[PDB]
Amino acid sequence: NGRQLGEVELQCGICTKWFTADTFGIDTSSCLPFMTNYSFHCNVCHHSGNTYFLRKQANLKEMCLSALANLTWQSRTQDEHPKTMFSKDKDIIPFIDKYWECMTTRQRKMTWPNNIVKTMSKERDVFLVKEHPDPGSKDPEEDYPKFGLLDQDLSNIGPAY
């Protein structure tokens, strides 16, 4: 499966295959791995024989999905001990904050930090939710709540064609 997880990859909405954006000289400086807020056609499938790339403003869900996918990929490849569950306050929100411009051109009291929990809590087939540490855990309360992706197969993440 010809994937390059961790690169900025883009799936073509017509042929449904995967590509890394670099392959085309697309500017990735404002891009992120594991985005879903775009529509892409490869140059084989698109009418003009050029690439098509339509970036959409990320909704709450896309922001969470991309933060979680990225935090989880980085933890899986860099940490001695991989985490799959990330803190809303210490991890998710600083991510969204930091890479804001990679997900939206909206200008920046932002109200989105209040709403990300509702967002993930209602998409239970996408997100894993722990309001509190497991009984018998040494995990400190301050770090909670915590969120993670139901589907740990990061290749499955893509636009909603």
- Residue closer to Zn ion by CB (options 20, 75) is 20
Query: How far apart are the C-alpha atoms of 33 and 24, rounded to whole Å?
Result: 16
Residue identified by tokens 């899986």 is 76
Smaller CB separation from Zn ion, 15 or 110: 15
Checking 93-99 for CB contacts under 8 A at 24+ apart, the result is 95/67, 95/70, 95/71, 96/63, 96/64, 96/67, 99/32, 99/66, 99/67, 99/70
Cβ atoms of 116 and 60 closer than 8 Å: yes
Using rule CB under 5 A, residue 21 touches Zn ion: no
Distance CA(84)–CA(126), nearest Å, equals 14
Regarding 53 and contact with Zn ion (CB under 5 A), the answer is no
Check binding of 110 to Zn ion (CB under 5 A).
no
Q: How far is the CB of 6 from Zn ion (least distance, A)?
A: 22
Q: Write the binding mask 22 to 51 for Zn ion: x where contact by CB under 5 A, - elsewhere.
A: --------------------x--x------
126 forms part of the interface with Zn ion (CB under 5 A): no
Site for Zn ion in 64-83 (CB under 5 A): none
> Which residue do the tokens 């990929």 mark?
73
Q: Does 10 participate in binding Zn ion (rule CB under 5 A)?
A: no
Q: Given the rule CB under 5 A, which residues bind Zn ion?
A: 12, 14-15, 42, 45
